[PDB]
Design a protein around this ligand. Structure first.
Ligand SMILES: Nc1ncnc2c1ncn2[C@@H]1O[C@H](COP(=O)(O)OP(=O)(O)OP(O)(O)=S)[C@@H](O)[C@H]1O
Ligand SMILES: Nc1ncnc2c1ncn2[C@@H]1O[C@H](COP(=O)(O)OP(=O)(O)OP(O)(O)=S)[C@@H](O)[C@H]1O
Ligand SMILES: Nc1ncnc2c1ncn2[C@@H]1O[C@H](COP(=O)(O)OP(=O)(O)OP(O)(O)=S)[C@@H](O)[C@H]1O
Lengths: 579, 327
């Protein structure tokens, strides 16, 4: 009985129970059975992607077999899971494993009721150059009963039959696929007592639902049975630790924290501190963003939609930041990331001046099949696979070549971002920002520092001249970055010096910062041009103030309360010591 | 446990015998003598004088070399009559037993036997401590036993603890007696740490008397020959310094990546390091990374599995590291 030395008697296990319940797979089972009930080519296959119930089906049919819920032909049949050592026990001496394979088929073929094999991984037999290379040992007898149910993913399947050509003329593919979200829940429910027993915890029914929905909207690279079950099992393990520490899987908190840990995506965590969350961010940003509350609100609005689920699952929120050059809109994208992730450097960004029709799409998403370089994902999906929710930033997107600009439509809506190798990324809870200086021409009208009605349409005009309407009409919001003028820049300067103090290495020296009109004007006069915007306010602060005082610090001429003043372009700040 | 009566009386009344080998090889000429040799054993085993349990320490040496009905058939054939047999086999051998016979899997109860932890190992060593002290006429420090088990776990990965720890104890005890009785006790450090190093290599466990003539001179001499790159020399010397006494992480090789202008000594330093470490530059294991393809790149270093043209695995790494632990 060679079979008993290599295979697992699934029937015996089923006879003894020790199997999971099988949920919703009745039709895959019916099809499997129907093929097995055939006169000749009774060789069905369970085919799809990993983690979709392919072996569940077998436990299922094993149970149907035990209970005679099968056709006459199968009523008394038995089933064995083989593979494994059948191909490797014969580690030495030519023809040894071949003899086993044959002996097994002989054992199966003769007399002993109807025996059905289950091949878990038919691709492992493959037919490695045929010429007696394992899989090739079968075909001679595929008509001679020796019924067998196979299993393989579509990639594996396609590889086998393309290279072989006979198996696809001998076997009956049965599509096996992930369940709907509700069906997934039913599955999770069926396995619920298994996990509850092994971990000693309860699972809320709503946790099963959350895991099913979450998996569908969280893990694009894992099929629902495994994906949702892992969310359940991983969560159960976490709960078991809590149980042991001194419980159940909490739909909201166990699963959300587990998910937050596993991947991130702020939306899946959603903090309960509503009094401040999604409120305070505008104030935090206001300090960074002086005057331009309009941009803050535009962003904050999208952030608020993603939280609590108002945002559309397939529409990553996205903005186009138009405006006065030097407006500070890039830092805004980082400061938003600051709030969103408690990480200003979470983002992925692309320098769009590097883009050309000759290569840009591949620089962004990676090259395709047969071409040099497999840096799949290029600048972008290469990184999305690690941080699906990171903020995306397109520096000077206005300079991006129009073809790659068009590819970026995927970020804006119908979020099926793909990779050059024919793979799918899928973005949802991912805020995307693109930048342009087109609004500068209208902001520079100076008709109030705030861009006004009508003039903002002139901006849209400039935008239509550079961006296709196909892009523009799909942006969550197009935001215009206004003139800061003297009032904002006086505040920006006071603020920049403050914010620098807080981050100026250590608070050992401290500042007075009494700029007085002299230094406020220096920074606001020889700095903030409308076309340089705030860029020079920071540069003068660093080039003249932080630098000269730093040099005095290095000489140990400064001990306490540093001040700022000017010579009176010769002003150049030029600050005294503070020893 | 039987003579001490820690065994159910059902079994306690039994006698235990170590069999095989001569049991078969005593005969030769005369076909069937082999069966005649197993046959009266397999009768006397139950003939009034209690039940005798046979011990086949190496079950895997039964079954038959090409089967040949080499009296192995007597076992299954008679196995219904108790005739209890206890045996043993290596994990690897068990696989062979099962595949070769089948019936043995059905007749025997497989039992996994665990490797002890260092803590458990030391307890074992303590039990045997007096045997070695008596056998050699030397004493053993308790910390020495701890050291042997702990040290072995870290520096004898090819040998399981029940043996590795004892090898260090027995070898060390002999080292003490041997030196003594040439033309005392086993010291955790001065005897075992040093003994293991003499056996396995690992200079850091020699607990050398001088980090001047091992580290200091290293920086000087590497600097004497390699001019400039002082930064690198110190980086290596310091990384090496951390391995002293085993302070460095038990799972991480000293490791460097040398970047820089060609002609700056990126490999010359490495040779000089070997020049210091083994007192010989040629003891460095050069890995020809210049020739790599993902389809050969690993295999030439680590070799391949059975069934592939040529086994002689390990071209550059396995074949050297198995013999040179601190290369
Ligand atoms: N009704 C079910 N019965 C048993 N297992 C289930 C069931 N539903 C989901 N599963 C999970 O799926 C696993 C086995 O089912 P599959 O999705 O076929 O996994 P698989 O991909 O067949 O396994 P391989 O060997 O990688 S194909 C189990 O270990 C469970 O975690
Ligand atoms: N309205 C604003 N929004 C954001 N940051 C601002 C604003 N006004 C001033 N800043 C400050 O200006 C600096 C950020 O400037 P950057 O974003 O590098 O310049 P930029 O205008 O983004 O350059 P671009 O976007 O390529 S034209 C920070 O120090 C901000 O605190
Ligand atoms: N700092 C140095 N002091 C003394 N001799 C040196 C020094 N650097 C290099 N040399 C000599 O020049 C060669 C340096 O050899 P290598 O270290 O291989 O050069 P390299 O940079 O390794 O070459 P590659 O291609 O990067 S391996 C040796 O043959 C030494 O004789």
């Amino acid at each position: 009985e060679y079979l008993s030395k290599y295979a697992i008697d699934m029937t015996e296990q089923a006879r003894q129970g020790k199997l999971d319940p099988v949920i919703g797979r009745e039709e895959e089972i019916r099809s499997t059975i129907r093929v097995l009930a055939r006169r000749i080519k009774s060789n069905p296959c369970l085919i799809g992607e990993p983690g979709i119930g392919k072996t569940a089906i077998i436990e299922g049919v094993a149970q149907r077999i035990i209970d005679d819920d099968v056709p006459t032909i199968l009523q008394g049949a038995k089933l064995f899971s083989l593979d494994l050592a059948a191909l490797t026990a014969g580690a030495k001496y030519k023809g040894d494993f071949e003899e086993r394979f044959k002996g097994v088929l002989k054992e199966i073929e003769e007399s002993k009721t109807l025996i059905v094999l289950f091949i878990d991984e038919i691709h492992m037999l493959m037919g490695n150059g045929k010429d007696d290379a394992a899989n090739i040992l079968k075909p001679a007898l595929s008509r001679g009963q020796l019924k067998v149910i196979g299993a393989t993913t579509n990639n594996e399947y396609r590889s086998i039959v393309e290279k072989d050509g006979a198996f696809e003329r001998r076997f009956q593919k049965i599509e096996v696929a992930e369940p709907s979200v509700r069906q997934t829940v039913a599955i999770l429910r069926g396995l619920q007592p298994k996990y509850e027993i092994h971990h000693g915890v309860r699972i809320l029914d709503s946790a099963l639902v959350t895991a099913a929905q979450l998996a569908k909207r969280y893990l694009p690279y894992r099929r629902l049975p495994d994906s949702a079950l892992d969310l359940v099992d991983i969560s159960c393990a976490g709960v078991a630790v809590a149980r042991d520490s001194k419980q159940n899987v909490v739909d909201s908190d166990t699963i959300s924290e587990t998910a937050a840990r596993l991947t991130g995506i702020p939306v899946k965590k959603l903090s309960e501190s509503e009094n401040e969350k999604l409120i305070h961010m505008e104030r935090d940003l206001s300090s960074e963003v002086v005057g331009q509350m309009d941009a803050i609100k535009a962003v904050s609005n999208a952030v608020r939609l993603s939280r609590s689920g108002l945002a559309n699952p397939r529409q990553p929120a996205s903005f186009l930041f138009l405006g006065l050059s030097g407006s500070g809109k890039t830092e805004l994208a980082k400061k938003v990331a600051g709030f969103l992730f408690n990480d200003e450097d979470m983002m992925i960004r692309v320098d769009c001046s590097e883009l050309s029709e000759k290569y840009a799409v591949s620089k962004l998403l990676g090259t395709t099949a047969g071409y040099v370089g497999y840096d799949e994902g290029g600048f972008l999906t290469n990184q999305l696979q690690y941080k699906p929710y990171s903020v995306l930033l397109f520096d000077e997107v206005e300079k991006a070549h129009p073809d790659v600009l068009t590819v970026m439509l995927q970020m804006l809506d119908d979020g099926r971002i793909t990779s050059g190798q024919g793979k799918t990324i899928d973005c949802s809870n991912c805020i995307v920002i693109m930048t342009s200086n087109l609004g500068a021409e209208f902001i520079n009208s100076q008709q109030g520092s705030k861009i006004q009605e009508s003039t903002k349409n002139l901006v849209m005009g400039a935008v239509r001249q550079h961006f296709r309407p196909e892009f523009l009409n799909r942006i969550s919001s197009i935001v215009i970055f206004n003139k800061l003028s003297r009032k904002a820049i006086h505040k920006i300067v006071d603020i920049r010096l403050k914010e620098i103090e807080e981050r100026f290495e250590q608070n050992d020296k401290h500042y007075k910062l009494n700029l007085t009109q002299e230094a406020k004007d220096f920074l606001a006069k020889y700095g903030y041009s409308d076309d340089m915007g705030a860029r020079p306010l920071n540069r003068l602060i660093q080039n003249e103030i932080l630098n000269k005082l730093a040099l005095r610090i290095l000489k140990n001429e400064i001990k306490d309360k540093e001040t700022v003043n000017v010579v009176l372009e010769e002003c150049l700040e030029v600050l005294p010591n503070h020893e």
